[PDB]
Amino acid sequence: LPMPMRFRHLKKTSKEAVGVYRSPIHGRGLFCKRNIDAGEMVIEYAGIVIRSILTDKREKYYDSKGIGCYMFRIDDSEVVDATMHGNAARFINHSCEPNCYSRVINIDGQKHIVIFAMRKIYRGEELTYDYKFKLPCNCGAKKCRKFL
Ligand SMILES: Nc1ncnc2c1ncn2[C@@H]1O[C@H](CN(CC[C@H](N)C(=O)O)CC2CN(Cc3cccs3)C2)[C@@H](O)[C@H]1O
Ligand SMILES: [Zn+2]
Known part of the structure; x- marks a missing residue:
């Protein structure tokens, strides 16, 4: 579906798709409450x-x-x-093998940062994206960069 169409009514669907809980990576994290399809727009x-x-x-x-x-x-x-x-979305932690990515989109003249699923994300998994910004990394991935 075209990018502006996909941005509409996220508030309602994100409340059912994700939740904030304690994270083993750091403090609190964003986790999914139901399977998220690959390419899906998760949350702003x-x-x-x-x-x-x-x-x-x-x-x-x-x-x-x-x-x-x-x-x-x-x-x-x-x-x-x-x-x-x-x-x-402000609780999304960093990972060197993320299941999500960030993008700056422009909807009807206004800028919005949206989170997309890079692969199918399964119920219970913590949502993570690669932060671009030394700070030690706790994602635990095999191919961990070891710093943010
Ligand atoms: N892969 C990682 N390995 C290690 N540390 C990580 C990782 N990925 C996120 N981090 C930390 O998390 C901050 C990014 N934060 C994401 C959500 C955070 N988990 C939260 O509970 O609020 C937002 C900042 C605002 N700060 C509020 C605080 C609460 C307690 C101490 S400071 C955290 C980052 O700047 C880091 O310090
Ligand atoms: Zn890492």
């Missing part, structure tokens, strides 16, 4: 598209209030701040 990384130059001061503010800072870097100029207006 919801939040506010902000200027990248403002992330340093925004993260400093959040850290000073004891509020966890959830951000997804679009490019050198833009970042999605999911701290206040986010959804369950």
Whole structure:
């Protein structure tokens, strides 16, 4: 189906497809509640598209209030701040053998970060994507890069 058609009514279907639980990779993670077909649009990384130059001061503010800072870097100029207006996608952990990938899509003039299933994902599995950004990696994959 064309990309703009696939983006419509994710809020309703993502509440039934995924859930947030403790993760053995790190803290909390996103897990699937039912089998997700390969190529399927899982969830949007919801939040506010902000200027990248403002992330340093925004993260400093959040850290000073004891509020966890959830951000997804679009490019050198833009970042999605999911701290206040986010959804369950903000808990997606990194893996060197991910079952998901991130993409910046443009729907009716507006930018959205969406998560796609790279293979069929089975009930109970944690959803992961490759983070592009040393920090030690705990994905546990055979072909682990050992750092994020
Ligand atoms: N494969 C990995 N191996 C090791 N560490 C990982 C991996 N993959 C995600 N990580 C960590 O997770 C952060 C990305 N986070 C994803 C969700 C996280 N699991 C959460 O519970 O909130 C979001 C940031 C915001 N921080 C809030 C905090 C809660 C507790 C301590 S800090 C976590 C990353 O920057 C890392 O520090
Ligand atoms: Zn890894």
